Write a protein that binds this ligand. Structure first.
Ligand SMILES: [K+]
Ligand SMILES: [K+]
Ligand SMILES: [K+]
Ligand SMILES: [K+]
Ligand SMILES: [Mg+2]
Ligand SMILES: [Mg+2]
Ligand SMILES: [Mg+2]
Ligand SMILES: [Mg+2]
Ligand SMILES: [Mg+2]
Ligand SMILES: [Mg+2]
Ligand SMILES: [Mg+2]
Ligand SMILES: [Mg+2]
Ligand SMILES: [Mg+2]
Ligand SMILES: [Mg+2]
Ligand SMILES: [Mg+2]
Ligand SMILES: [Mg+2]
Ligand SMILES: [Mg+2]
Ligand SMILES: [Mg+2]
Ligand SMILES: [Mg+2]
Ligand SMILES: [Mg+2]
Ligand SMILES: [Mg+2]
Ligand SMILES: [Mg+2]
Ligand SMILES: [Mg+2]
Ligand SMILES: [Mg+2]
Ligand SMILES: [Mg+2]
Ligand SMILES: [Mg+2]
Ligand SMILES: [Mg+2]
Ligand SMILES: [Mg+2]
Ligand SMILES: [Mg+2]
Ligand SMILES: [Mg+2]
Ligand SMILES: [Mg+2]
Ligand SMILES: [Mg+2]
Ligand SMILES: [Mg+2]
Ligand SMILES: [Mg+2]
Ligand SMILES: [Mg+2]
Ligand SMILES: [Mg+2]
Ligand SMILES: [Mg+2]
Ligand SMILES: [Mg+2]
Ligand SMILES: [Mg+2]
Ligand SMILES: [Mg+2]
Ligand SMILES: [Mg+2]
Ligand SMILES: [Mg+2]
Ligand SMILES: [Mg+2]
Ligand SMILES: [Mg+2]
Ligand SMILES: [Mg+2]
Ligand SMILES: [Mg+2]
Ligand SMILES: [Mg+2]
Ligand SMILES: [Mg+2]
Ligand SMILES: [Mg+2]
Ligand SMILES: [Mg+2]
Ligand SMILES: [Mg+2]
Ligand SMILES: [Mg+2]
Ligand SMILES: [Mg+2]
Ligand SMILES: [Mg+2]
Ligand SMILES: [Mg+2]
Ligand SMILES: [Mg+2]
Ligand SMILES: [Mg+2]
Ligand SMILES: [Mg+2]
Ligand SMILES: [Mg+2]
Ligand SMILES: [Mg+2]
Ligand SMILES: [Mg+2]
Ligand SMILES: [Mg+2]
Ligand SMILES: [Mg+2]
Ligand SMILES: [Mg+2]
Ligand SMILES: [Mg+2]
Ligand SMILES: [Mg+2]
Ligand SMILES: [Mg+2]
Ligand SMILES: [Mg+2]
Ligand SMILES: [Mg+2]
Ligand SMILES: [Mg+2]
Ligand SMILES: [Mg+2]
Ligand SMILES: [Mg+2]
Ligand SMILES: [Mg+2]
Ligand SMILES: [Mg+2]
Ligand SMILES: [Mg+2]
Ligand SMILES: [Mg+2]
Ligand SMILES: [Mg+2]
Ligand SMILES: [Mg+2]
Ligand SMILES: [Mg+2]
Ligand SMILES: [Mg+2]
Ligand SMILES: [Mg+2]
Ligand SMILES: [Mg+2]
Ligand SMILES: [Mg+2]
Ligand SMILES: [Mg+2]
Ligand SMILES: [Mg+2]
Ligand SMILES: [Mg+2]
Ligand SMILES: [Mg+2]
Ligand SMILES: [Mg+2]
Ligand SMILES: [Mg+2]
Ligand SMILES: [Mg+2]
Ligand SMILES: [Mg+2]
Ligand SMILES: [Mg+2]
Ligand SMILES: [Mg+2]
Ligand SMILES: [Mg+2]
Ligand SMILES: [Mg+2]
Ligand SMILES: [Mg+2]
Ligand SMILES: [Mg+2]
Ligand SMILES: [Mg+2]
Ligand SMILES: [Mg+2]
Ligand SMILES: [Mg+2]
Ligand SMILES: [Mg+2]
Ligand SMILES: [Zn+2]
Ligand SMILES: [Zn+2]
Lengths: 84, 50, 252, 109
RNA sequence: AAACUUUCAACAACGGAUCUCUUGGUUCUCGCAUCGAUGAAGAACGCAGCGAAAUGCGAUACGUAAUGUGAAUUGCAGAAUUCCGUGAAUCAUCGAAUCUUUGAACGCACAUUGCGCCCCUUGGUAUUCCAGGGGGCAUGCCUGUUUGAGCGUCAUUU
RNA sequence: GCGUUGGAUUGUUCACCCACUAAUAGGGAACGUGAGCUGGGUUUAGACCGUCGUGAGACAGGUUAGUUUUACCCUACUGAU
RNA sequence: UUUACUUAUUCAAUGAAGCGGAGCUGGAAUUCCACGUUCUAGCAUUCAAGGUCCCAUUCGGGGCUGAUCCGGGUU
RNA sequence: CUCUUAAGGUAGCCAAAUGCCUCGUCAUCUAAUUAGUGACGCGCAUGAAUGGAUUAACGAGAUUCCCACUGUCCCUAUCUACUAUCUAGCGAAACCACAGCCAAGGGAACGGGCUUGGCAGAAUCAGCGGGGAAAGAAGACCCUGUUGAGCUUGACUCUAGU
RNA sequence: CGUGGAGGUCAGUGACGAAGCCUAGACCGUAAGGUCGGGUCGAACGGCCUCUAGUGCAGAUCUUGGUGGUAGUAGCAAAUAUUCAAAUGAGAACUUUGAAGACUGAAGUGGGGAAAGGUUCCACGUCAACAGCAGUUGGACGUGGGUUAGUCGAUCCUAAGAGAUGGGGAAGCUCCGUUUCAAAGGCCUGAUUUUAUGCAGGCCACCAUCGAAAGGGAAUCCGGUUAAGAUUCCGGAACCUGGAUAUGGAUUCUUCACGGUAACGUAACUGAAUGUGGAGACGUCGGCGCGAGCCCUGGGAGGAGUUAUCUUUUCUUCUUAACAGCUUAUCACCCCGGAAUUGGUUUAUCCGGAGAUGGGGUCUUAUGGCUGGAAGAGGCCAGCACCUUUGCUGGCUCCGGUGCGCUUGUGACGGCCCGUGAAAAUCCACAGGAAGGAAUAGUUUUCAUGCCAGGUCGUACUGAUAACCGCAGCAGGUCUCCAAGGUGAACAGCCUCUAGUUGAUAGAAUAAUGUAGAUAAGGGAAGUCGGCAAAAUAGAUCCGUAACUUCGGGAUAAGGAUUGGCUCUAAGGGUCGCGAUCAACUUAGAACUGGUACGGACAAGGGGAAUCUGACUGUCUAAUUAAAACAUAGCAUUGCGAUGGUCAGAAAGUGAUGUUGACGCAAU
RNA sequence: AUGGUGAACUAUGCCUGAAUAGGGUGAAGCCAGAGGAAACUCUGGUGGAGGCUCGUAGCGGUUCUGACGUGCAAAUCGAUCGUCGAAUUUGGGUAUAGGGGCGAAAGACUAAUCGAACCAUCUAGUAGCUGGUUCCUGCCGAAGUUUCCCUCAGGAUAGCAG
RNA sequence: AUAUUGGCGAGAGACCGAUAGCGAACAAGUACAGUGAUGGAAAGAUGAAAAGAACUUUGAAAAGAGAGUGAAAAAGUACGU
């Protein structure tokens, strides 16, 4: 055993989907995401994991608000309207 | 499992909706580097891993 | 190089007690005004078996002196106690088997059980099946009672510490050979994961001080200093002597 | 012979998955899941099963009239007749002895 | 002598080298200072006449409003050509909005699209039950408000 | 030129004895011969003993258990077109 | 070195319920002792009835005592 | 009586899974026994919970003998199925400096090639295990390295704890 | 000498063809190299003087990519097996239909599920790739369709455990702890109705939350229906919960019912706080009883098969759900009565003056019967009409028997333990007596009937020799339910029914050597390290059985005999009133019989005498060691009386032993 | 070395479930009978015990040192075997995490990884050691010796060479 | 005044020129592997313009042979050389 016959017994998931990152790294019994650290308030990341930081850092999503912050700054955070 | 969580069923629904070949009118667009659906998945080849 | 078994026991992962089937902690009543000044009468409702304990327990129901309700207590049944028997607990209770009396209220030579080490700890001494404490004397000034414990030790306890008149039931239990690994197995299945025991000399040096060698042998004295450290205290800890005990006990 | 299947998704022979093979008006054999049997209510004094009390699962007693759950006596569907009688006799005799003890105490002083 | 083997050439294969390309990288320099409980970064799921993705967006869903430009978009279909016009566009700009489910993530939970409580309102006779709509209910701390606790304690009636 | 054996004990080479025989000669061939076998021994890891070692462990000492992989190529050989 | 004190510190319990000092009553010599429960697997809860005083009336309500006082040191 | 460091191997047991000498000696078992068993015992180096001796029952444990039984053998023969084989279709891998006939010589002291001889004729199929010091793996034995690691101990130097 | 790039220059070359590439064509140089021609090609590039470097490859078991010989080779050989014809098609060993032959043989190759997968389900189209042959077929490809719930699950409860808060620790990420050294509270309502709330009468708490699709748990069944969904749809028939409610009934002038000696009965028949009790709720094994379903079987009413002959024959249909009413038990209990000549009584020896036996009653409703549901359904037939939807028209669906039978449920018991074999949600009852209560009337939604609502998520399919994991369509692995006939002790092996499958690349030959399966004269272990392998034995009945022994065993010791078929004989039972009737197997014996065969296949111990060793059962080196190793019971030693022993933690107002207490825990 | 991730395999404890033909033997308890002066023996039944036993399903894995060994398979296949009602087998939930766990103890197991897992980083770690080290021509052209070294497969030094 | 391998906006280079240069010139932190932490590719070029080969013929079809487009098919999306 310990090879092919043992691989036949693999039908119980150690991890499921994480609510925070969606990676299937949420350890069911530990109730902790091995990837993002949920439910810890901080997002898990390590300076030895530079590639993982790059995978999950700012700019890898769509930046729904941060993408417009810069244009708003350039216009000086104006508040009125263009006023034809 | 036939008794699945709604989250699982939602993921399977998305996978089913995106299990299709490339639309044929793409490959007619002006520049169109796209040749085929390179992200096609099949239940017999690559598992979704949830 | 490895953490030995007796060291691993302290983390309490698989070495915790199997307490699922147990009836609850066997304790005397809380030491209250009624027991401190007079007595209170309870009734023995059931004499039941406790998993992992040789002695049977007695469920004894008392009235609550301050609220209209019943309070069930789990005593360790003394031998001769029966269901439907009235138990009397307090300073003024009679010297009858099953009653709970302060140690200072009983005469010399009284046999008691479930004796409190301190007044109100609800029972610490002579609780295992067949065991008992003997009252060997009183010191009324600076009120203390001298008692003999099952181990033969003499102990001085507060005269307000309580005990149950009689001997713990279930005695003679260890007189029957277990006769079978399976019987030891079922005994310890309901106590804790301490069985079976691998001999240290049957292990490797990494696993145990006694491990290794081209023969099974301890190699150095198995008597270990009291000041030795964890991982070293395997064998006979702080042994005053070894060998087949020839001679008398109760050293003067 | 006709063979049957479980009608629920529980495939294991647990206490809550007991079945009986019944024949339907279609002429065919089918499993019918059977509820766990009821235990008779028992006397609070002696533990014997209470006579005259319906035997149902716990929540079924909310769906039946008072007559099914009681007996017309001083402790009804709580204590059996003999235990109630022993309670009567003990109460009366002990109260009488209390009176006797009180007067004996008063006349011994 | 053929076949076969080997060598060379031509043509054809195999393969993708070379060459020439280059909306990419790399390094240097210069300038600037702007994420988030007013919910960020990140995630999930969705949204187009015909899209699987990338990109965009959020049930107002490849977008709404506003401003500028001034006639497109385009693979097809459709629409329009008044297009001398508050007006095309997958345009630019962007100050008004929307912004599902989440996430520090905030009613409690979450391997559940699980379970409450409060207010306003609508329907079912309906203050109490059920349902629909709208608005709410986290924690630490600060200032303040109100209601309190303590023979901690002052005075006063006594 | 021709033959030079059958057995008891031992993993054994060796040895020794029984017995037949005409005779039971000695040797080599990578101490012929393991993609020929076998694996009893030796020669990993399990285990026991004795002696040694404070010990971990040691012993050309004893004991018990312990995976023996591949040819379809070339040649050689055997046969075959 | 042995010993005392308690508020620091330490241990333990409880829903912090009866602690400490007095006192009433009885007995016996300022002191001592007593001061609600023991045949029985019943019962024991509604500010406790009762007693007493007040009010306010048809419902009743409140105080005191029943159940001593004092110190608020939970033990 | 002593002396080495306290005692000086008792009851038992043994060429025993412990005996070097050793295939010990004696008996028995056999035609023949380095085997077995029973004895013997100054026992290299047996021995008392580092347990001694013995033990019914049990054992996929080690061992000897006997009866039965047999292709284990004398000594091989034959039969069946599936292969191998040939064909259609399908179609890998190991390995490969270049390659592939020997004898001797010399040579890094065992050549496919070099030297001298023998020889030597296309293209091949099934087998085969002599050789390719065949393949598999930067020998695991051994030594070296101022390379480790597991483990041990009054090694050196420390340390949790106490 | 050559390469990438840079400054300068030749106003260098070039779409009239730069660079690159190919060229047994030419020239120069000793050489690194340079130059030219020809072909190909398409956009750039070169000479010289200098600058500069990521500047020159045969190797590194080099890196990446590509390609060979091997080689049309090894091979595509486990799971018994295929064949004929037609249809379709370009094409058929492989698709479809029919026929035939087989297999799984109910511990399935059947019918469902759990985990997992995720659309594989189903239809239409369809074959480039994939299905190591093929392919018209497919779990493929393309396009679509499909999963319907108050009652089945989740949801809720708690389990081992996980984990906030209050606190404490930690530089800190965070750790401890889960009721703790906390001011941790909503729900009743006097009164309030300046507002049923704040002031204000008065009742209860030693605590978040998560944790089970097998534990606990409110309630649904039957028939039909789809290409694919069904306890979900349709039809019918129920039930539960939450709520609202009005009649009828009941109750009250003796206000909160009557009857029975009683056990208790009922259509109802007030009941707050608080308390108590019960259910939820529990091991395993053994025999016995009963039920259900199945199996077997008789009669009859149909349909089919065989019919040279025989066979009142062989096969098949004849069914009845949840729910409801009446009724129905063992046990248990009550009344009468008073028992030795002790009786009753189980397969199992228990019970009785603490009241047996007996007579008469009460109760639980597992369960069964009858009836409703409901024959109108379903089943099986017949006679019809038939260009369609297809429609009819009728008939019958009945009555028994049997049991160490199988499966399963259950009851009353009995055996076992130094083992005595969850919890909580939740529901009910009782005690209590707060309160509210009647007479041109009050009381009762635990009696009947009536009204309304029941959300959310899952629901298709496979569940494996092809839907999961193992790189794959892998002889491996992966939890569970149902379970026919014969032989037979049997869920063994062998054959068969229902259902399913007939899938493993094929064809042809029959060399060697193999793999798997067999046989063998005479000898009988001489083979070999060694009886390795194989053989021999084997079921059942009867006989007989040694040493030794812990008296239990050894033991199936050893060693003998018998066994078929047939025709008989004897014995072993139920029920009813010795007779009548009914019924099933097991045992023993006898005669006869045969190529002396007969557990006829299948299935199925070899035995004995000893030594070493470990007591035994058990355990381990998954993937070279199963042992004498480990464990074990037994024995012994050691520490420790809690301000403790042993052991955790970085620390803690922190932990394990410990729900513990020397008959214990800890260490040997 | 630092910081993380794993108990879907397996090890062990816990919680909640589930699974296990047919035979042999015939323990307590019980009933009847016989012998005997008695004490008490003896017999026949009944019953159905056991970490009993034969043997299925199961769990395991002894031997063939069989098959296969470019496999069906990084552990399988066949036959033969151990065990088969309790220290039994097993699902799910849960706990224990790397000098840590877990271990009826094999240095076993801890996801084909174990005498210290996996992942990333420190890290292009160091190597007196092995391998490789890319154009042409021309001229000159060695050393394996001296001394010192924790040196003896290395270096410094002198020598030889440009 | 100083720092700035992150962000935003710019200007550059004796830098690399698709096995180079960031891992990623492209739907690249993508596909895919792993339970997980993590690991992590390959992959640019028809032509000026699709003018992407009408039509005929052989074939069941894929395709072929012609014809045609184009400067070139010695450019046919299996596309520069
Ligand atoms: K040792
Ligand atoms: K009743
Ligand atoms: K090591
Ligand atoms: K078996
Ligand atoms: Mg492993
Ligand atoms: Mg887990
Ligand atoms: Mg515990
Ligand atoms: Mg022990
Ligand atoms: Mg042991
Ligand atoms: Mg060992
Ligand atoms: Mg050690
Ligand atoms: Mg030591
Ligand atoms: Mg050893
Ligand atoms: Mg009733
Ligand atoms: Mg938002
Ligand atoms: Mg040799
Ligand atoms: Mg050889
Ligand atoms: Mg070999
Ligand atoms: Mg050899
Ligand atoms: Mg060997
Ligand atoms: Mg060894
Ligand atoms: Mg020694
Ligand atoms: Mg001696
Ligand atoms: Mg000797
Ligand atoms: Mg001997
Ligand atoms: Mg011999
Ligand atoms: Mg001794
Ligand atoms: Mg010894
Ligand atoms: Mg065994
Ligand atoms: Mg030669
Ligand atoms: Mg020579
Ligand atoms: Mg050679
Ligand atoms: Mg020659
Ligand atoms: Mg030739
Ligand atoms: Mg060969
Ligand atoms: Mg060879
Ligand atoms: Mg080497
Ligand atoms: Mg090596
Ligand atoms: Mg050196
Ligand atoms: Mg070291
Ligand atoms: Mg360069
Ligand atoms: Mg040119
Ligand atoms: Mg050439
Ligand atoms: Mg060009
Ligand atoms: Mg270079
Ligand atoms: Mg090269
Ligand atoms: Mg070279
Ligand atoms: Mg190479
Ligand atoms: Mg390569
Ligand atoms: Mg072949
Ligand atoms: Mg083969
Ligand atoms: Mg086959
Ligand atoms: Mg067919
Ligand atoms: Mg068969
Ligand atoms: Mg068959
Ligand atoms: Mg299909
Ligand atoms: Mg094929
Ligand atoms: Mg094909
Ligand atoms: Mg076709
Ligand atoms: Mg499809
Ligand atoms: Mg349900
Ligand atoms: Mg915590
Ligand atoms: Mg929950
Ligand atoms: Mg359940
Ligand atoms: Mg279906
Ligand atoms: Mg319906
Ligand atoms: Mg009535
Ligand atoms: Mg009676
Ligand atoms: Mg069963
Ligand atoms: Mg279904
Ligand atoms: Mg299904
Ligand atoms: Mg199936
Ligand atoms: Mg798969
Ligand atoms: Mg039979
Ligand atoms: Mg023969
Ligand atoms: Mg013969
Ligand atoms: Mg013979
Ligand atoms: Mg021999
Ligand atoms: Mg021989
Ligand atoms: Mg021999
Ligand atoms: Mg054999
Ligand atoms: Mg016999
Ligand atoms: Mg014997
Ligand atoms: Mg053993
Ligand atoms: Mg092994
Ligand atoms: Mg083995
Ligand atoms: Mg042992
Ligand atoms: Mg697990
Ligand atoms: Mg057995
Ligand atoms: Mg096997
Ligand atoms: Mg083998
Ligand atoms: Mg082979
Ligand atoms: Mg070892
Ligand atoms: Mg380097
Ligand atoms: Mg020269
Ligand atoms: Mg060297
Ligand atoms: Mg690149
Ligand atoms: Mg290139
Ligand atoms: Mg891994
Ligand atoms: Mg290209
Ligand atoms: Mg051209
Ligand atoms: Zn996450
Ligand atoms: Zn009772």
């Amino acid at each position: 055993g310990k090879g092919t016959p043992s691989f036949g017994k693999r039908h119980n998931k150690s991890h499921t989907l994480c609510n925070r990152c969606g990676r299937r790294s949420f350890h069911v019994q530990k109730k902790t995401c091995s990837s993002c650290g949920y439910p810890a308030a901080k997002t898990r990341s390590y300076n030895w994991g530079a590639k993982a930081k790059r995978r999950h850092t700012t700019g890898t999503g769509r930046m729904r608000y941060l993408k417009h912050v810069s244009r708003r700054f350039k216009n000086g955070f104006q508040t009125g309207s263009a006023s034809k | 499992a036939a008794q699945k969580s709604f989250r699982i069923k939602q993921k399977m629904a998305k996978a089913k909706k995106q299990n299709r070949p490339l639309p044929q009118w793409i490959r007619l667009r002006t520049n169109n580097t796209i040749r085929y659906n390179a992200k096609r998945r099949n239940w017999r080849r690559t598992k979704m891993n949830i | 190089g490895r953490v030995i078994r007796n060291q691993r026991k302290g983390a309490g992962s698989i070495f915790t007690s199997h307490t699922r089937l147990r009836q609850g902690a066997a304790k005397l009543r809380t030491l209250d005004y009624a027991e401190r000044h007079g007595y209170i009468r309870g009734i023995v409702k059931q004499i039941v078996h406790d998993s992992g304990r040789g002695a049977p327990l007695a469920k004894v129901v008392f009235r609550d002196p301050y609220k209209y309700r019943l309070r069930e207590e789990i005593f360790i049944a003394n031998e001769g106690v029966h269901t439907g028997q009235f138990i009397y607990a307090g300073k003024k209770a009679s010297l009858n088997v099953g009653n709970v009396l302060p140690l200072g209220s009983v005469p010399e030579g009284t046999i008691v059980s479930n004796v409190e080490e301190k007044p109100g700890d609800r029972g610490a001494l002579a609780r295992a099946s067949g065991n008992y404490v003997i009252i060997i004397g009183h010191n009324p000034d600076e009120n203390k009672t001298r008692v003999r414990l099952p181990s033969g030790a003499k102990k001085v306890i507060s005269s307000d510490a309580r005990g149950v008149i009689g001997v713990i039931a279930g005695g003679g239990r260890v007189d029957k050979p277990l006769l079978k690994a399976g019987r030891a197995f079922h005994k310890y299945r309901l106590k804790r994961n301490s069985w079976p025991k691998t001999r240290g000399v049957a292990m490797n040096p990494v696993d145990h001080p006694h491990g290794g060698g081209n023969h099974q042998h301890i190699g150095k004295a198995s008597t270990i200093s009291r000041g030795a450290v964890s991982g070293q205290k395997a064998g006979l800890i702080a042994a005053r002597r070894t060998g087949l005990l020839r001679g008398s006990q109760k050293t003067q | 012979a006709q063979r049957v299947t479980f009608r629920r998704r529980n495939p294991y022979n647990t206490r809550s998955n007991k079945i009986k093979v019944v024949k339907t008006p279609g002429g065919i054999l089918r499993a019918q899941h059977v509820k766990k049997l009821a235990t008779r209510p028992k006397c609070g004094d002696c533990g014997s099963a209470l006579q005259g009390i319906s035997t149902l699962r716990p929540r079924q007693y909310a769906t039946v009239s008072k007559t099914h759950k009681t007996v017309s006596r001083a402790y009804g569907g709580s204590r059996c007749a003999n235990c109630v009688k022993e309670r009567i006799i003990r109460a009366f005799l002990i109260e009488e002895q209390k009176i006797v003890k009180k007067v004996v105490k008063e006349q011994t002083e």
